């Protein structure tokens, strides 16, 4: 059981990265830009009504 839950948790961690971005230690080395790119016309932010 312990191994099964270990694989289940680490699998869950991978899916968490997809649903929302997560801190991953910050910047490592020279800043090489946004690897996945920038989206100009999209806002992730939640509005106060």
């Amino acid at each position: 059981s312990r191994v099964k839950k270990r694989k289940k948790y680490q699998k869950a961690q991978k899916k968490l990265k997809s649903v929302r971005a997560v801190y991953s230690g910050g910047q490592s080395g020279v800043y090489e830009g946004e690897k996945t790119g920038i989206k100009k016309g999209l806002t992730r932010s939640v509005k106060f009504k």
Partner: protein
């Protein structure tokens, strides 16, 4: 520009890893009325329910609606104005409480919603990671609070 709200960092999927004692709880107008009917103290019946300190919170909307109820509900207004009950300011025109409570919880995932209204509850239950509190039978009940 297209806007799609971010998923709150407080939620591991639909599990809220942020809400934690002492808890912050939003009071609906019906919650106060029913509590008087069942002879359950607000601060304690919540403390008994969750076995933790509770910080009751009332917005301007719920306070306004309590005042509008009239002399028949004079008791509820007095209990609502107990000093331990902290107050939240509102910056939206409408005095409708149901939408204000829903808007607040959508944004900050720290609040339990204390209400018995069937319509309001359904909207809250759809929002993920929101514990929902109600008064039923003899005492308070909490539905979506894993730590219990």
């Amino acid at each position: 520009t297209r806007n799609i709200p971010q998923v709150s960092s407080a939620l591991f999927f639909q599990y809220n890893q942020a809400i934690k004692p002492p808890y912050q709880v939003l009071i609906d107008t019906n919650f106060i009325n029913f509590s008087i009917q069942k002879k359950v103290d607000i601060v304690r019946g919540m403390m008994d329910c969750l076995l933790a300190k509770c910080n009751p919170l009332i917005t301007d909307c719920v306070m306004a609606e309590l005042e509008k109820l009239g002399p028949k509900y004079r008791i509820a207004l007095k209990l609502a104005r107990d000093p331990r009950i902290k107050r939240l300011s509102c910056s939206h025109k409408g005095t409708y409480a149901d939408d204000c409570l829903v808007h607040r919880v959508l944004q900050h995932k720290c609040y339990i919603v204390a209400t018995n209204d069937a319509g309001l509850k359904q909207r809250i239950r759809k929002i993920p990671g929101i514990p929902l509190m109600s008064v039923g039978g003899h005492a308070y009940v909490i539905e979506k609070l894993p730590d219990v």
